[model samples]
Target: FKGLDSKTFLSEHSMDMKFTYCDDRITELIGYHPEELLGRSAYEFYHALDSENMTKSHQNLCTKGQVVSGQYRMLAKHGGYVWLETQGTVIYNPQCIMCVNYVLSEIEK
Candidate 1:
């Protein structure tokens, strides 16, 4: 993972934005530092071109309460973009469904 480069970059200057779950494991895969992403919405990092489809799929998953799978593009930190097949599942606790858990695997472009 250390040798891998996703050609992605983050807004180093953003003061009030961060991601909730940006760990080293995730950073290695997604190409952003945990501090860069922590507390920010995942949608904030999505490529604008893919936003429509991503949002639509998210809405569908939330509305239907089922796992949804789809192919979409994501902006790489370095440059250009990569194709990803994402699977989103709703996780439920004894209380209720907590949040959507998304697993994304890179696909050949």
Candidate 2:
């Protein structure tokens, strides 16, 4: 996917787990079995640059409604890092629950 665009997904973050709804392409991008990530925290799959930053960004977005983080590091379950460009937004689910929707595109460094 040399110059392909980002693949999008929806995520909900909570203490017990971070659940994500992604397309099949996501499986090839991140090595986790779609089912395996069900009960896990997304923080485990991302770089250690968050909690604070992630919180602020997510919070900031609810008000601003959108964000495009140019480059970020994410881990593949198989090992090694994959660079990506992420664009995100705050959206309400059918249940009226607020969630973060992010679009991720692979980038070669």
For this target, which candidate reaches the highest lDDT against the unseen true structure? 2
Scanning candidate 1 in windows of ten residues, the lowest lDDT window is 8-17
Cα RMSD (Å) between model 1 and the true structure?
7.5
* Global fold similarity of model 2 (TM-score): 0.61
Number of backbone collisions per candidate: 15, 0
Global lDDT for candidate 2?
0.53
Relative to the true structure, how large is the alpha-carbon lDDT of every model? 0.49, 0.53
lDDT digits (tens) for residues 9-77 of candidate 1: 222111122334433554555555667665666576567877998778767756675434365665656
Residue-level lDDT tens digits of model 2 in 1-109: 4334345444544433365444455566665566776667656766666345655655555557566554556776667656665555555441212333233544323
Task: Tell me the lDDT of candidate 1.
Answer: 0.49
